[PDB]
Amino acid sequence: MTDQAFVTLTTNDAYAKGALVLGSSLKQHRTTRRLVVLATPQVSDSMRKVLETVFDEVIMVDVLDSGDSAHRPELGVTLTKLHCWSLTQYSKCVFMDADTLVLANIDDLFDREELSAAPDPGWPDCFNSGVFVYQPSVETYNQLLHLASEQGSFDGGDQGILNTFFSSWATTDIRKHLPFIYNLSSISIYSYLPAFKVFGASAKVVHFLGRVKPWNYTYDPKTKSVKSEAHDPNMTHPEFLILWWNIFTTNVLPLLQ
Amino acid sequence: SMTDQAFVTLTTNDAYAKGALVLGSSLKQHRTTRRLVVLATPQVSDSMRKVLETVFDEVIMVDVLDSGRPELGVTLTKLHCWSLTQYSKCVFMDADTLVLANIDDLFDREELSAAPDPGWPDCFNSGVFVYQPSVETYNQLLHLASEQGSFDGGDQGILNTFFSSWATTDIRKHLPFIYNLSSISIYSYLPAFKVFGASAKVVHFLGRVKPWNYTYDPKTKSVKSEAHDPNMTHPEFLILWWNIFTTNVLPLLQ
Numbered sequence: 001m002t003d004q005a006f007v008t009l010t011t012n013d014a015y016a017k018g019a020l021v022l023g024s025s026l027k028q029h030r031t032t033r034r035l036v037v038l039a040t041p042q043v044s045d046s047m048r049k050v051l052e053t054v055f056d057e058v059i060m061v062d063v064l065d066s067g068d069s070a071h072r073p074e075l076g077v078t079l080t081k082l083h084c085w086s087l088t089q090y091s092k093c094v095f096m097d098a099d100t101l102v103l104a105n106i107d108d109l110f111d112r113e114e115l116s117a118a119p120d121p122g123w124p125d126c127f128n129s130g131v132f133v134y135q136p137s138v139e140t141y142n143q144l145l146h147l148a149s150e151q152g153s154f155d156g157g158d159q160g161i162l163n164t165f166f167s168s169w170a171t172t173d174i175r176k177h178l179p180f181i182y183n184l185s186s187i188s189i190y191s192y193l194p195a196f197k198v199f200g201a202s203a204k205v206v207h208f209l210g211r212v213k214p215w216n217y218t219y220d221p222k223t224k225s226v227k228s229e230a231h232d233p234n235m236t237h238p239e240f241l242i243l244w245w246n247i248f249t250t251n252v253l254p255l256l257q
Numbered sequence: 258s259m260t261d262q263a264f265v266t267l268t269t270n271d272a273y274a275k276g277a278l279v280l281g282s283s284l285k286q287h288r289t290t291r292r293l294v295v296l297a298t299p300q301v302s303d304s305m306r307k308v309l310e311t312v313f314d315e316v317i318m319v320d321v322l323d324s325g326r327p328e329l330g331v332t333l334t335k336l337h338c339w340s341l342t343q344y345s346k347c348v349f350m351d352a353d354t355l356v357l358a359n360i361d362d363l364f365d366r367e368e369l370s371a372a373p374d375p376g377w378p379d380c381f382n383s384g385v386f387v388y389q390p391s392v393e394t395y396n397q398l399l400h401l402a403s404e405q406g407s408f409d410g411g412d413q414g415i416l417n418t419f420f421s422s423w424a425t426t427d428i429r430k431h432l433p434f435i436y437n438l439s440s441i442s443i444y445s446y447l448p449a450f451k452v453f454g455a456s457a458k459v460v461h462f463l464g465r466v467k468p469w470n471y472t473y474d475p476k477t478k479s480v481k482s483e484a485h486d487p488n489m490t491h492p493e494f495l496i497l498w499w500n501i502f503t504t505n506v507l508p509l510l511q
């Protein structure tokens with residue numbers, strides 16, 4: 001469709017790398033929808049140009065910052081996601097974290113209604129805000145900005161405010177619970193390997209959730225091996241990390257260096 | 258119903274029995290009107306059964322079912338809970354659970370109601386579930402187990418395979434997480450616990466370290482802490498476990 005889009009967010013050049021791989025993976029798997037990246041003034045002029053070659057729209061927006069929460073102190077800036085409700089040139093969109101990677105076609109997500117999301121691991125009565133189907137609207141956008149300013153986020157980021165706003169999600173319509181194939185984190189592979197061993201081959205989206213991102217690794221292509229002098233508690237599944245670095249190396253890196 | 262609905266647990270040895278005793282005491286503390294039943298296997302000592310009989314309304318001796326954490330092969334023994342057709346509806350609770358408020362309203366639920374598992378929320382966690390004893394379901398589950406086995410070697414995989422519709426059908430079969438709150442979930446997303454946690458109704462000490470594995474100091478009300486420990490970020494539940502044990506269960510062990 002023409003009025004539908006995949007939307008991601010980059011507030012700097014490091015996450016722009018994630019968004020570029022994400023956009024490239026949506027192309028690899030033949031999305032029929034438009035690709036949109038929301039970018040802030042900290043993204044370099046040259047990176048915005050690169051983004052415009054993968055994404056149909058690059059929308060400049062201002063940073064929204066929860067601030068210096070006690071609740072990863074970098075993640076105050078995630079409140080910048082709420083701008084996704086301002087994109088009213090589209091009837092329906094799928095927001096995807098710039099740290100996600102598409103493994104198969106997921107256009108069937110546009111069958112779903114707002115707010116459709118997958119349960120968060122760790123607290124599964126909240127949804128994970130890395131992949132969600134939503135409906136652009138000026139009223140919702142404004143309602144969300146109001147909640148963010150007046151009450152804030154219980155986790156200091158977008159996921160708190162979004163769960164607080166869409167707080168019937170856990171107990172209403174199971175059709176808004178995305179199956180886990182649409183937002184699979186490495187934390188869940190680690191938590192319950194037997195599940196991954198038996199269903200994992202069905203995964204359509206990988207979410208590289210947690211402090212250490214695929215672009216914070218060193219990757220040797222000659223060995224197809226990855227390392228980093230910063231431990232990851234979520235045992236980032238290497239098959240997936242290697243997949244990310246392949247798409248990056250072949251489709252994205254030549255754009256940058 | 259007072260005679261016709263029950264909370265059911267399982268103990269295949271005297272260590273997990275202490276867990277069952279704490280569970281049972283906790284359900285009485287919070288004045289359940291339902292029966293309290295524990296399934297026990299022969300590794301449970303004769304004198305421990307006699308103790309379990311002081312708290313539970315009935316101890317019921319079952320055969321160990323092993324699939325063949327390797328100590329969780331015996332968790333297929335849980336399947337025996339569907340044999341309890343003296344009850345029309347039961348709540349099964351692991352012996353590693355602990356009740357913090359009255360949970361009788363779980364009997365409003367229909368088979369199979371369970372909470373999302375915190376690792377892999379598309380599967381339900383098999384530590385707290387509402388079910389209906391049935392000779393038919395029981396036998397179908399035995400057959401599935403012998404035939405296919407379990408994808409995790411334990412009860413949770415087989416149960417999820419059997420009740421496969423749980424994730425995608427009827428949100429009423431998803432219990433709220435406060436009916437099976439795992440301490441690893443306090444720790445992994447602490448922000449959520451600080452705002453939602455005060456209404457926890459059941460805590461499940463899931464994972465390899467169980468409360469009775471701790472060294473507890475009864476004078477100071479402290480436990481010797483492990484070298485990394487999610488229990489010690491919100492230790493109130495673990496000291497509650499040991500309070501109930503030291504206060505209510507220990508004098509029954511003499």
Ligand SMILES: O=c1ccn([C@@H]2O[C@H](COP(=O)(O)OP(=O)(O)O)[C@@H](O)[C@H]2O)c(=O)[nH]1
Nearest residue numbers: 009010011012015078097098099130209210
């Ligand atoms: O410095 C940042 C951090 C956040 N993000 C955006 O906000 C999303 C959510 O942050 P992140 O994925 O790192 O949090 P997590 O998934 O690990 O909880 C990212 O994927 C980006 O799209 C960003 O643009 N710049």
Ligand SMILES: O=c1ccn([C@@H]2O[C@H](COP(=O)(O)OP(=O)(O)O)[C@@H](O)[C@H]2O)c(=O)[nH]1
Nearest residue numbers: 267268269270273328332351352353463464
């Ligand atoms: O050696 C054992 C192991 C398991 N269990 C029973 O099976 C349940 C499931 O095991 P556990 O709670 O250890 O698994 P987890 O919830 O940690 O995955 C226990 O709570 C007990 O009711 C038991 O009686 N003896």
Ligand SMILES: [Mn+2]
Nearest residue numbers: 097099130209
């Ligand atoms: Mn993310």
Ligand SMILES: [Mn+2]
Nearest residue numbers: 351353384463
């Ligand atoms: Mn347990």
